[PDB]
C-alpha cells in the first residue's frame, strides 16, 4: 500500500524527482498549500442536510478531496500531519456512517445517505479509498478495522447490494458505483466486492464493469449521451481500469475490446475545440479539457502509449495528474518531447455498434484554433438528449461561432434549484427551436417526446474528408408525421479566400402545407444586414406559444424574397458573413431576429440572439446558406482589413431531386457545389442551372471556377 | 542619424544585445516576419478614396507603419532591402502628394488629403519621419530632396500654416499636428518647423506644444476628456518630447512643469484596471495598456527614472517598445529587477489647475486583480463628455463589475458609419440613464445640454484613504433646476469577510415632487432576487420615451418598500450581492429590470441588463446600498463555497442632515457607517438609530461591531 491509482514504486519515483519538474511541483505545492489551509479549520464532518451545492454537500466533497490529497502528501513528503488529518477524517466518518439513513433532502430515484443522491456518494468513495490506500502504512490494526467496518464496508454495501437498480445499471451512474465498490474491493483485499463490480451482483456478467465497457462506447470510443457525459464517465472507467491493471495485470484491461479505454480517451479529446467540449445534449458551456477526468486519463494513456502528441494537449490543459503517470507526462514535457496533436476529421457512429447515426467532426486548418464543423446526425441519447436532429455547430479562431445552448442548469449553485436541471431545461434547452436545425409547425422533433425519439436515428448518407472539401449528409425521415428532411454540410477550401467556407443545404418535403423555421444561433455583434427590418414599434412580443417559442422575444421581422440575403457580424478579431437563400414555391418568407428571455421570471436563461429563417404555408423548401469567416479587426493596434464579405450572392437550383449551389464571389469567380444524393462514385449527373449546364460524377462535386 | 525616437547610441546598444533578451527578440522577429510578408506585396500606394476603416485609409496606415518598421530594421540588421523598401514607398508618396487636393470623402471640420481627416495625416507623418530619419544616411542627395520637397515639406505645410484652426488648437488634435510638424523639423534640420510647433504659428506661445503641456493636463497629469483620450494624446506628447530631448536636451523637456510628462504616464497607468482603461466618457471597451502609446511612454519613463515597478506593468502589457528605451526595459526584466506596481488610492483633480471636481480612484487588495472603485465627480470634458455626474464603476477579480458603457462606435469598421460615432452615441451612450447615477424625471443631467454642462463641475466634499476604509463624497447642485444631490461612496475593510464591501449613500432633495431613478449596470448572470417580480405578460415595452429611456426594454417590475432588498449575481468564479434600501416619504417604490436594444434598428447596441431603483413621487430620497463580492464557483473542478450573501440587511437613518447606515451581517456582527458632511475632524456628532445612539467625530466614521 498504496497499490491502486498510485503504487509504492510510483511514490518512490515521485519523492525522488517531483521538485525537478516545474509545472508538477507548482501543482503539488498549490495542493499542499490549499490542504494546509483546509487543515487549519480542523476536522469538519457535518451531519448530512443539504442537497446539491448546499453546505454539507460541498463540505463532504471538500473532505473526499482532502482525504485523497492528504494520503498522497503523506506518502510523498513523509509528514505525519497529513496522515493524522486523513486518519481523523476517516475515523469521524466511521463513527457517523453506521447511523445514517436516507439523506434528509434525498433525490427521489437514487437517494444517498452522506449525499442527496448516491452518485456523489460513489465519487466520495472513489476518492476516499485512494486516501486510505495511501495511509495504511501509518495506521494501527484497530484503526484499519474501525474505518473499514465503520464507513468503507457499509458504504460499499449501500452502493451495491442495497442499490441493485444503480449497481446493475448499464449507465455512467453504474460505472461510478462499480468503480467505487471495486476499488474498495482491491484496497480491502475483498474478492467479493471486486467480483460483483466486474461481473454484476449475480456475477454472471449480465451487468457490471465488463458489460459497461461493451455497451457504453461505440467501437471508436464514443459515448452516446455526448462529450459532457463522456468525460464524466471517463474517470470511473479509467480509474477502475488503473486499479485493475495495478492489482490484476493478467486481466489485460487496457487491451480489452480492441483497446476501448485508450480509444475513449482520444475520442474525448477529439470531442473538444480550443479547450472546450462540444456542448451538444445536456452540457455546460464551461466544461473543458482541464476537467480532472481527462487530466488523469491523458496521463494514464501517455504512460501506456508514449504518444508524444498527447503532450500538446497536456500543455493546453494547464493541469497535470499528481500521480506516477502524471510524473511521466511532466518528465517528457520537460525533455522537450512535445509533438503537435494530429486533429482529424472523423465520423463517429453512434451506439454500441456504431451504427445508429453519427457525429461528424470536420476540421480544417493548423494548430488548435482551426475551423471545426460539427454535424449532429446522432441517435437520441435518452433523457439527456436534445430534440435537434441534424443540428450543427461551427468553431473558428478559438471561438464558438454557431452555437449550441447546452443545458439550463447552474452547477452546484444551491440558489438555482440545488444545482439541478431548471424548469427551462425541458421547456427551452431541449427544444428544437433552441437549435440550428429545422422546426416544423413550431413543434419539436418527435413532438418533444423522448420515448418516440429513442426509437429512431438519422440516416447518414455520405461522409467525405479531402484537401479540396469536406462533406456530411444525413436524412431525417421520422421527426414529424408526413415530413422528411435531408441536410448536407460542407467545408470548402477556396484558394482565393482567407478561410474555408461552410455550405449548407437543408431540403424538406411535407405532405401538408407547413411552417418551416431554420434558426442560426450566432456569437458576436451584428455589423449589418442586407435586408430591411420592419419597425418593431417599441415592443417585443413573445415569439410563439409553445415548445420553446414562449422563451423568445421577437426583436424584428424582415420580409425576404427570391434573392439571397446577408448578415455580417464581428466576434473578437474576425468577421463572419452568413449568406442565405431559400428555394420554395411559397412567397411567405421572413427573417425573424429574436432574443432569449421570455417566460424567464427567475432569470435562469442567458442573453442570446438568433436569426430565424421562416417559410409559411409550404410543402417544399431548400434552405441554402454560406458561412464565411473573413477579415481582421485589431482593437489594440487599431487596424482592420477585409471587413466586407467576399460573397456577392448565393443561388440554388434543384432538378430531379439533385441540387446545384452557385456561390458568386466579388472578384468575379464562383464556386459550384453539386449534390446528387447517389453514392455511386462513377454515376454521371446533369443539372440545368439557369444558363449553364452542370455535369459531375458521384454523390457530390465542388468546383472553383 | 537616426536621432529622433531612436539614436545612433540606441542602435549600437540594440545591435550589441537584442538577441540576448527573449521577449524583445521575439517581437522584433515578429515585426521582421510581418514586414517581409508585406514587402512581398510590393509598393502599394493607392490614390486616396476611402474614409475611416476603408481600404485606402487602412492601406496608408499599413504604409506608415511599414516605413517606420523598415527604417528601424535597416538600422538593426544592416539589410539594404529594408532601406530600399522605405525609400521606394517614400518616393511613391513624393510623386503622388503634390497633386493631392482635399480627400474625396473628407471630414467637414478638419479635412485631410491622404486621409479623410487631418488627424490620421499627422499620425502618418509622425511614423514616416522616423523611418526617413533611419534611412537618410543611406540615400543619395537627389533622393532626399525629392522625398523632402515632395511629401514631408508639403505635408508639414498642410498640417501647420494651411490648417491654423487645428495647428493652433489647444486639444490633442493640436498635439498630433505639432508633434508631426516638429519631428519633421528636427529630422530635416528646419528651425522654422520646430519653432512654430513649440510656440504656435505666430511664435508667441499663445498656442503650440508648450501651451498644450500647461493646459491639457492637471498638475497631476490627468487629461480632462478621460483615459481614452489621455492614452491617445500620450503618444504625440511623449514622442515629440523624446525628439526634443534627443535633439535639444538643454530644453529639459522631461522636467517641464514639475515633470508633467512623467506624471502623465503614471496617471495613464493609474487609470487602468487589469489591463484596461476605465471606460468613462467617450471610450471603447477594448482599449487597454498594450496600446502602443503607453508601451512607448512606459519605456521612455523607465529609461528616465529607473523605476523598477514599471517593469511589472510592462510584463502585463505583453508588448515591448522596439526602441533603445524598450531595450532597457527588456534588459531590466531579464535581470530580474521587476518590483510590484504600487497601486494607490488617488484623487485626480480635474481641469488644467486640478480644481474642477475630481476623479476618485479607490483601490484595495494585493496584485493586479484587486478591488477598485471609481467615483466620477468630474467636469464635463466638453463634447466627449457624458452626462453622468457622480457616476461610479466597480472592478473586482480582474473584471468590470459595475459598468460604464463607453461610446456607441465601432473603431475603423466602415460599415458602422465609417468607424465614426453612431446615432446612438448621443441618444444612448451619453445619457444619464445609461449610467450608475441619479436620474430626475427621466431627464439627463443639465437636460443633456453640453453648453450648460460645460459651465459646472461637482463639488468634492471629502476624500479619505486608510486601512480601515476609503471614502469619496461629492455634491452636484447644478444638474437640474431646484435639485441638489450628494453621493458618498465607501470601500470598507471588514476583517470577517473575504473581500471589501462598497457602501453607497446618495441623497437627493428637490423643490418639486419628482421621480428619482438610480440604475446599476452590472456584469454577470442573475442568481436570484429577494423581491417578487410582477408577471411581464409576455411582452417587453420600451421603458420611456426620451433621453435614453427609448433604448431600454422593461423586462420586469417589482415593488419594494421599507425593508432592504437584494440582488445576487455570478461572474466567472465569484458572486456579487447588491443589498439596497431607499429612505423616502414616497408612497411607492419599484425596482425595474431593463435590457438594452429598443430603438436600435441597425443593431449598434450591445446586449446589457440593468437594475433600476425608482422612487415614484417625492421631494427627498436617500438611496443606500452595499455591494459585496463573496464566495467561489469553479466550473472546472465542480465546486462552490460561500455562494450566499453574508449581508442580512441594510438599514438607514437620517437625523438633522446626518446619515447612519447599519449593515447587519449573518454572523450577528454589524458595520456602522456614519456621515456628518462636516469637514471639521474634531466635531462630535450624534444620531439616534434604532434605540441605540450613534456617536462619532468628523466627516465620516466606520465601525465594525463584532
Ligand atoms: Zn442542445
Ligand atoms: Zn459613459
UniProtKB/Swiss-Prot annotation, chain A:
Swiss-Prot/TrEMBL site (Neutralizes the sugar carboxylate group at subsite +1) positions: 172-173
Identify the coding gene: alg17C
Q: What Pfam families does the database record attribute to this sequence?
A: Alg17C_C, Alginate_lyase, Hepar_II_III_C
Organism superkingdom: Bacteria
| Organism of provenance | Saccharophagus degradans (strain 2-40 / ATCC 43961 / DSM 17024)
GO function terms (MF aspect) = exo-oligoalginate lyase activity; metal ion binding
So which cofactors does this thing need?
Zn(2+)
Annotated effect of mutating residue 409 to A? 4400-fold decrease in catalytic efficiency
Which compartments does it reside in? Periplasm
Please state how the activity of this protein depends on pH. Optimum pH is 6.
Keyword Signal among record annotations: yes
Q: Which family does it belong to?
A: Belongs to the polysaccharide lyase 17 family.
What this chain does, per the entry, is described as: Catalyzes the depolymerization of alginate through an exolytic mode of action, via a beta-elimination mechanism. Preferentially acts on oligoalginates with degrees of polymerization higher than 2 to produce the alginate monomer, 4-deoxy-L-erythro-5-hexoseulose uronic acid.
Catalyses which reaction? Cleavage of 4-deoxy-alpha-L-erythro-hex-4-enopyranuronoside oligosaccharides into 4-deoxy-alpha-L-erythro-hex-4-enopyranuronate monosaccharides
Query: What does the UniProt entry list as the effect of changing residue 231 to A?
Result: 2000-fold decrease in catalytic efficiency
Can you say what this protein is called?
A: Exo-oligoalginate lyase
Record note on quaternary structure: Homodimer.
UniProtKB/Swiss-Prot annotation, chain B:
Q: How is it used?
A: Could be used as the key enzyme to produce alginate monomers in the process of utilizing alginate for biofuels and chemicals production.
What is known about temperature dependence?
Answer: Optimum temperature is 40 degrees Celsius.
| Compartments reported by the entry | Periplasm
GO MF annotations in UniProt: exo-oligoalginate lyase activity; metal ion binding
Keyword Zinc assigned: yes
| Leading EC class | lyase
Which terms does the UniProt entry file under GO BP?
polysaccharide catabolic process
State what this protein does: Catalyzes the depolymerization of alginate through an exolytic mode of action, via a beta-elimination mechanism. Preferentially acts on oligoalginates with degrees of polymerization higher than 2 to produce the alginate monomer, 4-deoxy-L-erythro-5-hexoseulose uronic acid.
Oligomeric state and partners? Homodimer.
Question: What is the designated name of this protein?
Answer: Exo-oligoalginate lyase
Taxonomic placement: Bacteria, Pseudomonadati, Pseudomonadota, Gammaproteobacteria, Cellvibrionales
Amino acid at each position: 500500500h498504496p497499490n491502486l491509482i498510485v503504487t509504492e514504486q510510483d511514490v518512490a519515483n515521485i519523492a525522488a524527482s517531483w521538485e525537478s519538474y516545474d509545472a508538477y511541483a507548482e501543482q503539488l505545492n498549490a495542493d499542499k498549500t490549499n490542504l494546509d489551509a483546509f487543515m487549519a479549520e480542523g476536522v469538519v464532518v457535518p451531519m448530512p442536510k443539504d442537497a446539491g451545492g448546499g453546505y454539507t454537500h460541498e463540505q463532504h466533497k471538500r473532505n473526499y478531496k482532502a482525504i485523497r490529497n492528504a494520503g498522497f502528501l503523506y506518502q510523498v513528503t513523509g509528514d505525519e500531519k497529513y496522515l493524522t488529518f486523513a486518519k481523523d477524517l476517516l475515523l469521524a466518518y466511521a463513527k457517523m456512517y453506521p447511523s445514517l439513513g436516507e439523506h434528509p433532502n434525498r433525490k427521489e430515484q437514487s437517494p444517498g445517505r452522506l449525499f442527496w443522491q448516491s452518485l456523489n456518494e460513489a465519487v466520495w468513495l472513489v476518492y476516499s479509498i485512494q486516501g486510505y490506500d495511501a495511509i495504511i502504512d501509518g495506521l494501527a490494526a484497530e484503526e484499519k478495522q474501525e474505518i473499514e467496518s465503520g464507513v468503507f464496508l457499509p458504504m460499499a454495501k449501500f452502493l451495491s447490494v442495497e442499490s441493485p437498480e444503480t449497481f446493475n445499471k448499464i449507465h455512467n451512474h453504474g460505472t461510478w458505483a462499480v468503480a467505487a465498490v471495486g476499488m474498495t474491493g482491491y484496497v480491502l483485499g475483498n474478492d467479493e466486492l471486486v467480483e460483483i463490480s466486474l461481473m454484476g451482483l449475480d456475477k454472471t456478467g449480465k451487468a457490471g464493469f465488463m458489460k459497461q465497457l461493451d455497451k457504453l462506447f461505440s467501437p471508436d470510443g464514443y459515448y452516446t449521451e455526448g462529450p459532457y457525459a463522456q468525460r464524466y464517465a471517463l474517470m470511473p472507467f479509467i480509474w477502475f481500469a488503473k486499479a485493475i491493471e495495478t492489482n490484476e495485470p493478467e486481466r489485460k484491461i487496457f487491451e480489452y475490446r480492441n483497446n476501448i479505454l485508450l480509444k475513449a480517451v482520444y475520442t474525448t479529446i477529439d470531442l473538444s475545440y480550443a479547450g472546450y467540449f462540444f456542448p451538444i445534449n445536456d452540457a455546460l458551456k464551461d466544461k473543458g479539457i482541464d476537467t480532472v477526468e481527462l487530466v488523469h486519463a491523458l496521463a494514464i494513456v501517455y504512460s501506456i502509449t508514449g504518444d508524444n502528441t498527447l503532450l500538446d494537449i497536456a500543455q493546453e490543459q494547464g493541469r497535470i495528474s499528481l500521480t506516477g503517470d502524471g510524473l511521466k507526462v511532466a518528465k517528457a514535457v520537460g525533455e522537450g518531447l512535445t509533438q503537435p496533436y494530429n486533429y482529424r476529421s472523423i465520423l463517429l457512429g453512434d451506439g454500441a455498434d456504431g451504427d445508429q447515426g453519427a457525429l461528424s467532426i470536420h476540421r480544417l486548418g493548423e494548430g488548435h484554433n482551426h475551423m471545426a464543423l460539427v454535424a449532429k446526425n446522432t441517435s437520441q441519447g435518452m433523457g439527456h438528449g436534445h430534440f435537434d436532429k441534424l443540428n450543427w455547430l461551427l468553431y473558428d479562431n478559438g471561438n464558438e461561432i454557431v452555437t449550441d445552448y447546452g443545458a439550463a442548469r447552474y452547477l452546484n449553485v444551491e440558489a438555482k434549484y440545488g444545482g439541478h436541471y431548471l424548469a427551462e431545461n425541458n421547456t427551452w434547452a431541449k427544444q428544437t427551436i433552441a437549435h440550428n436545425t429545422l422546426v416544423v409547425n413550431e413543434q419539436s422533433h418527435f413532438y418533444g417526446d423522448v420515448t418516440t425519439a429513442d426509437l429512431h436515428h438519422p440516416e447518414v448518407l455520405s461522409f467525405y474528408s479531402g484537401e479540396d472539401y469536406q462533406l456530411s449528409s444525413a436524412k431525417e425521415a421520422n421527426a414529424y408525421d408526413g415530413v422528411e428532411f435531408v441536410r448536407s454540410m460542407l467545408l470548402v477550401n477556396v484558394p482565393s479566400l482567407e478561410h474555408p467556407i461552410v455550405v449548407d443545404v437543408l431540403n424538406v418535403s411535407a405532405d401538408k402545407a407547413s411552417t418551416f423555421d431554420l434558426p442560426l444561433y450566432f456569437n458576436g455583434q451584428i455589423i449589418d444586414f442586407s435586408f430591411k427590418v420592419k419597425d418593431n414599434k417599441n415592443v417585443m412580443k413573445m415569439l410563439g406559444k409553445r415548445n420553446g417559442y414562449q422563451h423568445l422575444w421577437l426583436r424584428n421581422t424582415a420580409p425576404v424574397g427570391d434573392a439571397s440575403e446577408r448578415a455580417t457580424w464581428i466576434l473578437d478579431d474576425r468577421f463572419y458573413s452568413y449568406a442565405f437563400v431559400t428555394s420554395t414555391p411559397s412567397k411567405k418568407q421572413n427573417v425573424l431576429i429574436a432574443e432569449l428571455g421570455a417566460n424567464d421570471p427567475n432569470y435562469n436563461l442567458r442573453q442570446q440572439q438568433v436569426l430565424i429563417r421562416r417559410v409559411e404555408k409550404a410543402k417544399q423548401a431548400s434552405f441554402v446558406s454560406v458561412l464565411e469567416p473573413h477579415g481582421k479587426y485589431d482593437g489594440s493596434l487599431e487596424t482592420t482589413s477585409g471587413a466586407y464579405s467576399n460573397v456577392k450572392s448565393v443561388k440554388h437550383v434543384s432538378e430531379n431531386g439533385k441540387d446545384v449551389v452557385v456561390v458568386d464571389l466579388k472578384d468575379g469567380s464562383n464556386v459550384v457545389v453539386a449534390l446528387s444524393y447517389n453514392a455511386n462514385s462513377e454515376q454521371v449527373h446533369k443539372v440545368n442551372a439557369g444558363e449553364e449546364a452542370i455535369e459531375w460524377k458521384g454523390f457530390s462535386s465542388v468546383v472553383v471556377r
